[PDB]
């Protein structure tokens, strides 16, 4: 504890996300909506819209 401020310990947490074509096994708290077809609308599938 008597050292300088540049030599203090640091707790480092490394979090990495997989961004591939795999289905989303684990992800965040978002709400899903019932599916309808044959209309000019906006969709949202696994994080990507259109």
């Amino acid at each position: 504890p008597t050292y300088g401020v540049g030599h203090q310990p640091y707790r480092v947490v490394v979090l990495s996300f997989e961004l591939l074509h795999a289905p989303a096994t684990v992800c965040g708290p978002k709400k899903s909506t019932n599916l309808v077809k044959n209309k000019c609308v906006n969709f949202n599938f696994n994080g990507l819209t259109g």
Binding site: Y3, G4, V5, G6, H7
Partner: protein
């Protein structure tokens, strides 16, 4: 106003031992990367030493104005090299005032 300038010439510089010598946050370099100083090598190395206030650490930059950079120590507009800055609270502080 009277900052020291030390000329370093005709030796071999090992730049990996600076981190174990002073407790500084950023080994702030401008035109070079710190970890590739061993492969390439320069012609001459200059060493300067001064102590300023905490509000003028950001004034150590090319193209900067203020109080230190306008009357005391102006870096050139094409400056390259590394700048080392660490605090001296445990070495240069007095209860009556460091005058």
């Amino acid at each position: 106003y009277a900052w020291n300038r030390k000329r370093i010439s005709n030796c071999v510089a090992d730049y990996s031992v600076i981190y174990n010598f002073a407790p500084f946050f950023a080994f702030k370099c401008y035109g070079v990367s710190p970890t590739k100083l061993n492969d390439l090598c320069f012609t001459n190395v200059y060493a300067d030493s001064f102590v300023i206030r905490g509000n003028e650490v950001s004034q150590i930059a090319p193209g900067q104005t203020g109080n230190i950079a306008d009357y005391n120590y102006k870096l050139p507009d094409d400056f390259t090299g590394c700048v080392i800055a660490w605090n001296s609270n445990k070495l240069d502080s007095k209860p009556s005032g460091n005058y």
